[PDB]
C-alpha cells in the first residue's frame, strides 16, 4: 500500500442517492401484490404485522407471528439492494469495470 498514509476519513464514499435508490428498488417491487401472499405484498404484509404488533407495544412479536418472516426477507432483499447499489455506484465512479 504505497497510498493510504492516514486512513482517509471518507472511507465509505458516501452517495446519499444510494440508500434512497436501494430502498426504492426493493420496496417498490416489495409493494407488488402477488398470488402467493393472497394478493397482498411483502411490504404490505410486513407493515400490516408492524401495525398488529404495535397494537400491544411492550409485548413483542411471537414465534408464530409471521412478522419475523416478513422482517427477515424484506431486510435480506433491502440490505442486499443497498449494498449492491453502493458497490455498483462506487465501481461505476471508480474502475472495477
Amino acid at each position: 500500500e504505497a497510498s493510504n498514509k492516514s486512513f482517509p476519513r471518507d472511507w465509505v464514499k458516501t452517495d446519499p442517492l444510494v440508500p434512497v435508490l436501494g430502498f426504492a428498488g426493493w420496496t417498490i417491487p416489495a409493494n407488488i401484490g402477488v398470488s402467493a401472499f393472497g394478493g397482498q405484498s411483502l411490504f404490505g404484509l410486513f407493515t400490516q404485522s408492524i401495525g398488529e404488533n404495535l397494537a400491544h407495544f411492550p409485548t413483542g412479536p411471537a414465534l408464530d407471528d409471521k412478522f419475523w418472516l416478513y422482517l427477515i426477507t424484506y431486510h435480506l432483499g433491502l440490505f442486499l439492494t443497498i449494498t449492491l447499489g453502493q458497490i455498483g455506484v462506487q465501481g461505476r465512479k471508480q474502475g472495477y469495470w
Partner: protein, 159 residues
C-alpha cells in the same frame, strides 16, 4: 479500482496495527477519544469516578436479576446491589495493587498523537495518578451501585 481503505498505522507499515474502520473511523475515534480513559488532561480521580459510576451501575444488574436471591421480591435488589458493592471493592483493591506493581520503571520514550505533536504522558500512568484513580473508582462504583438500587426503587418501568 482505486480507494483502498485499510492502511498501515500512521502510515508506518512496520509498526503493525493496520488502521481500519473499526480502529480509525471518525465516529469510532471520536467516541473512544471522548471516553474518560482517553481524557489525558483531566485529573485521574474524576475519570475514575466516571468509570466507576458506570461500571458499578452496570454490574449490579446481573447480580440483581440472576443472583441466588433473584426470585425474592424485595431482597433481590438489595442482595444484588450488595454483591455489586463487594465486587467494586475487590476491583478497587485490584486497581490499587496494580498501581503498586506497574508504576516503578518510569518509561523514557515520549508519545505522539498520530499527527506529529508530542504530548505529555497521562498522569494516570503514575503511582499517584493511579492511586487517585483507584480512589475515584471506588467512590464512583459504590455510588453507582447505590444509584442502581435507587433506580430499582424509583424508576417507573422497572420490572
Amino acid at each position: 479500482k482505486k480507494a483502498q481503505v485499510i492502511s498501515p498505522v500512521n502510515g508506518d507499515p512496520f509498526v503493525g496495527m493496520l488502521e481500519t474502520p473499526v480502529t480509525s473511523a471518525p465516529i469510532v475515534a471520536t467516541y473512544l477519544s471522548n471516553l474518560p480513559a482517553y481524557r489525558t488532561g483531566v485529573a485521574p480521580v474524576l475519570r475514575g469516578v466516571e468509570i466507576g459510576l458506570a461500571h458499578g451501575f452496570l454490574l449490579a444488574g446481573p447480580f440483581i436479576k440472576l443472583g441466588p436471591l433473584r426470585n425474592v421480591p424485595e431482597t433481590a435488589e438489595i442482595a444484588g446491589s450488595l454483591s455489586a458493592a463487594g465486587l467494586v471493592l475487590i476491583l478497587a483493591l485490584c486497581l490499587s495493587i496494580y498501581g503498586s506493581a506497574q508504576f516503578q520503571s518510569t518509561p523514557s520514550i515520549g508519545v505522539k498523537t498520530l499527527s506529529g505533536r508530542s504530548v505529555a504522558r497521562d498522569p494516570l500512568f503514575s503511582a499517584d495518578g493511579w492511586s487517585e484513580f483507584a480512589a475515584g473508582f471506588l467512590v464512583g462504583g459504590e455510588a453507582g451501585v447505590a444509584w442502581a438500587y435507587v433506580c430499582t426503587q424509583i424508576l417507573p418501568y422497572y420490572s
